[PDB]
Each structure stands twice: as structure tokens, then as C-alpha cells.
Design a protein around this ligand. Structure first.
Ligand SMILES: COC1=C(OC)C(=O)C(C/C=C(\C)CC/C=C(\C)CC/C=C(\C)CC/C=C(\C)CC/C=C(\C)CC/C=C(\C)CC/C=C(\C)CCC=C(C)C)=C(C)C1=O
Length: 175
């Protein structure tokens, strides 16, 4: 079934908000899962209820009014992968992989065309990370209404609708 499992505790995915005059804050999802099937389909499942902004009231507002987690508990990324290309990586070697990754977020699947860095760490372990800075536009996933609700709740003049995302994921073959 699975050629690789996500090492959930070693892996992270962060996103960055900006409010007011460039007050940047990096937030995280504390719970990720995933794997790569023997049919060559890599998946990352992001637990939207695990959002961590450092502020409990804010976290609650993001769950309820932004992601609407009672409807959308998770966001799922799916990426076809060449398992032979990954297998052929020497220990320590990297490769760039151009992907059309599907992101299912907030009830709107969309494609992220980006480049990933894949590096082999051991006979069983690989590290996968965004090669380049990666931006998500809220409006692409019908999240701009959510951001406006957050802005109003916090009495802010402006919150940016463009959100950088960074991740470092570790996938492990069966040992
Ligand atoms: C009381 O406290 C409060 C405040 O502070 C005092 C506030 O500021 C505020 C105001 C609030 C804010 C400033 C926060 C506003 C929040 C904003 C702007 C964020 C909006 C978020 C978004 C638009 C999106 C969030 C991002 C995600 C869900 C991540 C999506 C995931 C992405 C893009 C990753 C895609 C993955 C890939 C391309 C590949 C993944 C790799 C694989 C599958 C492996 C492949 C394998 C191989 C081998 C190649 C409130 C309400 C408050 O209550």
C-alpha cells in the first residue's frame, strides 16, 4: 500500500500573516499526516484544527470563521511522484521536482505549480521541502471573506490576503 509514511513529529508546515504595517507572524499546523503510495501518489494531510498562532482566541477564530473546520477539518495535498527517481537518489543527493500539486482547501481544489527539493538522508528517509518561496492567495480558496471577518473582529485596518507557506517534510520507507 505505502512506499513511504510521513514522519509526523519531525515534519512542519508554517504560514505567514501580515497585519497593520508589515507586522509579520509565522503560524504552524501542529498535526500533519501523510504518505506515498506504491502507485506513486504522495499525500500531505494538514489538520486545520491544529492551527497554532500562539493565541488561543485567535486560533479559535481561525478554526471557526476562516477554515470553517466543522465543515473542513483537513486540507489535503496530492502530488504524483516518480518512485524510481526517488529510489535512485544516492544518500545525501538532492533533485528538483516540478509539480502540479492539488491542494484541497476550504472546499476548493486548486493546483499549486511549484518546485520541490527532494533529498535522500538515508536508505529509508527523504526530506521534501518547497525549493522556492511559495505564496497562497486567500481568494483562490474563497478565504478572503474569512480574512475580512478576522480583520473586523480584531479592529485592524488591514490584513494581507497573500500568505507565504513553507514546509519541511520527512517521509520514511518501511524499516
Ligand atoms: C485576540 O487575538 C487576535 C490577534 O492578535 C492580537 C489578531 O491579530 C487577529 C487577526 C488575525 C490575523 C492577522 C491572522 C490572519 C490569517 C491569515 C491572513 C491566514 C490565511 C491563511 C491562508 C490563506 C492559507 C493557510 C495555508 C495553508 C492551509 C497551507 C496550504 C498548504 C500548502 C500551500 C502546501 C502545498 C504542498 C505542496 C506544494 C507539496 C507537499 C509535498 C508533498 C505532498 C510530498 C511530495 C513528495 C515527493 C517525493 C516529491 C485575531 C482574529 C485575533 O483574535
Amino acid at each position: 500500500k505505502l512506499a513511504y509514511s510521513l514522519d509526523a513529529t519531525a515534519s512542519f508546515l508554517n504560514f505567514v500573516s501580515s497585519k497593520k504595517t508589515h507586522v509579520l507572524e509565522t503560524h504552524r499546523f501542529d498535526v500533519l499526516s501523510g504518505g506515498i503510495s506504491t502507485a506513486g501518489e504522495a499525500q500531505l494531510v494538514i489538520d486545520l484544527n491544529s492551527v497554532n498562532t500562539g493565541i488561543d482566541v485567535r486560533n479559535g477564530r481561525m478554526r471557526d470563521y476562516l477554515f470553517e473546520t466543522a465543515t473542513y477539518s483537513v486540507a489535503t495535498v496530492t502530488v504524483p511522484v516518480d518512485l524510481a527517481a526517488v529510489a535512485g537518489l544516492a544518500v545525501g543527493e538532492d533533485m528538483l521536482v516540478d509539480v502540479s500539486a492539488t491542494l484541497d482547501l476550504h472546499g476548493v481544489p486548486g493546483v499549486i505549480d511549484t518546485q520541490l527539493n527532494v533529498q535522500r538522508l538515508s536508505a529509508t528517509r527523504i526530506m521534501v521541502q518547497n525549493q522556492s518561496p511559495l505564496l497562497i492567495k486567500a481568494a483562490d480558496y474563497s478565504l478572503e471573506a474569512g480574512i475580512e471577518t478576522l480583520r473586523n473582529l480584531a479592529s485592524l485596518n488591514v490584513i494581507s490576503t497573500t500568505v507565504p507557506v513553507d514546509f519541511v517534510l520527512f517521509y520514511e520507507a518501511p524499516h
